[PDB]
Amino acid sequence: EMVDNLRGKSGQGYYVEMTVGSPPQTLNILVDTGSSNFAVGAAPHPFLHRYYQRQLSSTYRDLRKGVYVPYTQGKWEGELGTDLVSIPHGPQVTVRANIAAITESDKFFIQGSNWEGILGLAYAEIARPDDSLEPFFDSLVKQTHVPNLFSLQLCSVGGSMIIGGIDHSLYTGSLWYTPIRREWYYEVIIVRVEINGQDLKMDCKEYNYDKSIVDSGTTNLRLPKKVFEAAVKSIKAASSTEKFPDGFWLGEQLVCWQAGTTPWNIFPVISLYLMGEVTQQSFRITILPQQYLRPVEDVATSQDDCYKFAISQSSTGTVMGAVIMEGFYVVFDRARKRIGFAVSACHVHDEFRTAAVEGPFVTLDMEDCGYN
Numbered sequence: 418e419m420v421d422n423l424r425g426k427s428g429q430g431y432y433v434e435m436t437v438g439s440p441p442q443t444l445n446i447l448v449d450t451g452s453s454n455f456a457v458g459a460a461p462h463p464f465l466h467r468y469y470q471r472q473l474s475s476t477y478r479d480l481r482k483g484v485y486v487p488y489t490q491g492k493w494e495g496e497l498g499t500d501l502v503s504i505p506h507g508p509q510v511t512v513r514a515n516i517a518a519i520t521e522s523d524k525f526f527i528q529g530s531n532w533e534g535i536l537g538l539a540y541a542e543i544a545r546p547d548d549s550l551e552p553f554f555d556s557l558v559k560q561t562h563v564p565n566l567f568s569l570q571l572c573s574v575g576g577s578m579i580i581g582g583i584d585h586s587l588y589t590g591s592l593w594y595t596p597i598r599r600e601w602y603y604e605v606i607i608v609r610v611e612i613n614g615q616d617l618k619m620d621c622k623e624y625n626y627d628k629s630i631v632d633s634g635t636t637n638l639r640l641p642k643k644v645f646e647a648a649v650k651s652i653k654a655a656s657s658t659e660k661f662p663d664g665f666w667l668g669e670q671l672v673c674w675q676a677g678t679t680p681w682n683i684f685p686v687i688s689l690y691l692m693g694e695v696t697q698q699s700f701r702i703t704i705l706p707q708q709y710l711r712p713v714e715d716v717a718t719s720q721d722d723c724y725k726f727a728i729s730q731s732s733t734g735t736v737m738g739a740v741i742m743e744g745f746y747v748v749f750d751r752a753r754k755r756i757g758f759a760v761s762a763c764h765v766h767d768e769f770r771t772a773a774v775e776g777p778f779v780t781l782d783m784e785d786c787g788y789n
């Protein structure tokens with residue numbers, strides 16, 4: 418009953434239906450493994466179709482404390498409180514959780530996105546104002562019998578969030594696990610990067626400067642500058658049969674082809690090798706251009722198919738965003754401090770190539786790839 422409980426629009430996040438308050442007020446909430454605050458629109462905004470009305474909830478409790486949360490894109494401020502929360506197409510339970518009632522925001526809500534709030538699924542360590550503000554998933558686990566794990570199958574878009582377990586109908590092949598290095602963001606270690614099978618040949622610490630994370634709330638694969646530049650050079654070289662404006666590689670301009678003629682085969686596969694559970698072992702996840710060239714729907718341009726380059730630069734380390742998670746079944750196994758990856762039932766592939774999760778791989782180099 419939890420399958421296909423996620424919806425969204427390409428590039429604008431995936432959301433799950435939730436209710437807050439008594440009587441229940443239904444809101445669509447973006448699923449975000451890259452933050453740890455549960456927050457909902459709580460005042461009128463041009464891009465909000467609806468919002469949380471605290472005055473109408475008898476179970477609402479004001480904590481008399483403001484909070485401000487900045488993201489890479491957007492920011493908001495609001496009032497902290499607690500109230501009853503349920504998930505209609507998730508586990509049938511009711512929990513009392515912290516909620517930030519957003520009363521002011523800047524470049525956060527997105528014109529026509531269909532969500533009104535955000536569910537930060539990361540750990541308390543990064544919650545605002547501080548780690549004493551217990552995150553929603555922690556409250557869910559403490560107050561119910563739900564196992565300490567969830568999984569995300571991100572595929573107008575759709576997908577599934579399976580709370581408390583693993584749904585085997587959602588993936589094929591093996592689940593490979595990489596350790597969660599530190600419990601704040603979902604931090605992992607990348608040990609190797611290849612572009613069409615060619616190693617970027619970089620000290621692996623560069624891939625994890627200064628942390629690498631799995632972040633469903635960020636669209637792009639975001640890379641440290643040194644890695645971004647090397648990857649772009651390699652993708653340019655592989656695709657050199659066609660030349661694109663510099664602005665494209667900067668995500669500042671679309672590339673378009675006549676409908677149905679997108680030359681997928683001139684763009685390389687990208688393989689990210691993640692640290693395994695055993696010393697000097699790794700596995701790789703392989704990303705097709707259908708993932709990192711993100712479709713931009715626009716009827717005005719619809720004689721063509723157009724795309725944005727969904728790999729970009731970061732000054733805070735690697736962010737494996739939605740375009741990386743798409744077509745993989747990703748298990749956030751908090752109980753065992755590990756992240757699992759498998760090919761999902763909605764995997765990306767054409768008749769020549771396919772997204773993959775494969776291992777084991779071994780390196781003789783004993784260096785630890787963690788930056789700190």
Ligand SMILES: CCn1cc2c3c(cc(C(=O)N[C@@H](Cc4ccccc4)C(O)(O)CNC4CCOCC4)cc31)N(C)S(=O)(=O)CC2
Binds near residue numbers: 525635
């Ligand atoms: C979904 C809307 N959206 C589109 C883009 C893009 C983007 C970044 C973000 C972004 O900051 N995501 C927020 C959640 C959020 C979701 C919807 C609207 C606003 C915010 C987060 O919590 O997940 C960040 N997590 C941290 C990131 C840094 O490392 C620590 C964790 C969102 C983006 N980029 C900067 S991008 O992907 O490069 C360009 C496009």
